[PDB]
Design a protein around this ligand. Structure first.
Ligand SMILES: *[C@@H]1O[C@H](CO)[C@@H](O[C@@H]2O[C@H](CO)[C@@H](O[C@@H]3O[C@H](CO)[C@@H](O)[C@H](O)[C@@H]3O)[C@H](O)[C@H]2NC(C)=O)[C@H](O)[C@H]1NC(C)=O
Ligand SMILES: *[C@@H]1O[C@H](CO)[C@@H](O[C@@H]2O[C@H](CO)[C@@H](O)[C@H](O)[C@H]2NC(C)=O)[C@H](O)[C@H]1NC(C)=O
Ligand SMILES: *[C@@H]1O[C@H](CO)[C@@H](O)[C@H](O)[C@H]1NC(C)=O
Ligand SMILES: *[C@@H]1O[C@H](CO)[C@@H](O)[C@H](O)[C@H]1NC(C)=O
Lengths: 49, 35, 35
């Protein structure tokens, strides 16, 4: 549900779509995420290792 | 490259500036090319 | 439905762009259709 469950009812969002919203608040457009989806997943998944 | 994209037609806000005025220009041109 | 609304005209910004071109184009049509 992302973060909407901290203000009332919980609403579902695809996880790929949700990460675009976080980049939107940072200051970078959401388009850059989809153009680099594959390497980010490898970068993030190996980060926790 | 974008995964999960879908097919549909997008509308330019300038289609009412082109599709609705190119037709007026066509409407004039048909009245203009007839003579 | 909105309370407190007032009366005036929303000056179209697309209008001067087309008007300046219509100062050409509408003039051109009268320049080209008349002969
Ligand atoms: C959205 O609409 C567009 C336009 O109709 C679709 O693009 C076209 O998709 C077909 C098959 O999906 C492509 O045919 C393929 O051509 C290749 C050769 O490049 C051939 O090897 C394949 O076996 C197949 O016949 C067609 O080329 C393609 N048109 C262009 C201009 O690339 C698109 O698939 C639609 N997408 C969805 C999700 O509906
Ligand atoms: C704003 O202007 C509109 C006209 O576009 C006014 O609407 C008219 O109001 C009169 C009575 O006030 C009616 O008899 C007309 O039938 C209305 N015409 C339309 C097209 O609505 C409106 O009253 C004006 N409002 C203010 C606050 O000036
Ligand atoms: C079409 O051309 C005729 C010929 O003069 C003219 O009377 C008429 O106003 C024109 N109409 C438009 C819409 O241009
Ligand atoms: C008016 O039409 C003539 C052709 O009849 C053309 O040569 C001229 O350039 C036109 N006027 C303008 C300002 O373009």
């Amino acid at each position: 549900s992302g973060w909407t469950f901290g203000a009332g009812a919980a609403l579902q969002i695809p996880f790929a779509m949700q990460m675009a919203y976080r980049f939107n608040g940072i200051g970078v457009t959401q388009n850059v995420l989809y153009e680099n989806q594959k390497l980010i997943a490898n970068q993030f998944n190996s980060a926790i290792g | 490259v974008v995964i999960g994209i879908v097919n549909n037609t997008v509308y330019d806000p300038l289609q009412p500036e082109l599709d609705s005025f190119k037709e007026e220009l066509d409407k004039y041109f048909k009245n203009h090319t007839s003579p």
